[model samples]
Target: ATMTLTDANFQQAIQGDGPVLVDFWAAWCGPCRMMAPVLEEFAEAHADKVTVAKLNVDENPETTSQFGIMSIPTLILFKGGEPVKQLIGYQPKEQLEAQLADVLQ
Candidate 1:
């Protein structure tokens, strides 16, 4: 299941057990919408080992600004509550999976 990542829960969620993948996006962004399904699919596929969630840039400006999210559909990977890796823009499944695989381990 996709976790609803808000400003309130963002810290706790990312600080939890295992790796986290945060999809920073907004409703008005066409690219963000395009990447939604890919994010969902990846979340479902890696449900046990990874924490996958979405944060709306429009709703959560604090995190957006903190992370310097200049683009929608930015995928930020976190470990130990710290950002480890980031990929901006839409990415193919294989490419994303490779990145996730590398980080999760």
Candidate 2:
């Protein structure tokens, strides 16, 4: 379920049934770098219904600005391309899974 997302492709990938989680990250951010594997692991595990992706904030400005993302490691969970949850900073995989409990239902 995990895929690399960019300004050109973000809409197509996120605008769907999935329960999409988009990570707005920068290469230089330590927390964002660390959280990468966790999301990958979780996303892969939940591949049956969820979609996960990474958007390099440094390279993707359109979506970042549209979402008012001001920090690295910002995560937005969307339902049908409509954002339902917004998380900032690094959240543990456990917490993330727990957070999505409601949406995934």
Candidate 3:
């Protein structure tokens, strides 16, 4: 399952023992909606190995501003409590999975 990440829980959630994948999106974003299923699948597939979550940019302005997320469907990869990789815009499942595989490894 994909966890709901908010500004209040952003730091605590991402700064854990392992890698974290944060999906920054908004409800009205077309691309974001299109990418939702891919993210869900990714989260389920790698539940044990990594933390997968989604943060609504509209509801979490603080986090959005902090990360300078100017686009929807932005995927930020974190490791050791720090951001390591970022993917802007919608991405296919294979691409996202490959990126996650690279990051988790």
Candidate 2 TM-score to native: 0.85
Q: Against the correct fold, how does model 3 do in TM-score?
A: 0.86
After superposition, which runs of candidate 3 have C-alpha atoms over 4 Å from their true positions? none
lDDT (C-alpha, whole model) for all candidates? 0.78, 0.78, 0.77
Between prediction 2 and prediction 3, the one with superior lDDT is: 2
lDDT score of model 1?
0.78
1-105 in candidate 3: lDDT tens per residue? 338867878777777766778888788898888888777877787686877778887787765677788788898887667888888888887787777567756
Model 1 misplacement above 4 A: none
Worst 10 residues of 2 by lDDT: 42-51
Q: How many backbone clashes does candidate 2 have?
A: 0
- What overall lDDT, based on C-alpha atoms, would model 3 receive against the true structure? 0.77
Q: What lDDT score goes with residue 63 in model 1?
A: 61
TM-score of each: 0.87, 0.85, 0.86
Cα lDDT tens digits for candidate 1, 7-84: 877777777656777778887889878888878887787786777878887777766688788688888887678888
Number of the predicted model whose TM-score against the real structure is largest: 1
* Model 1, residue 22: C-alpha shift (Å): 1.2
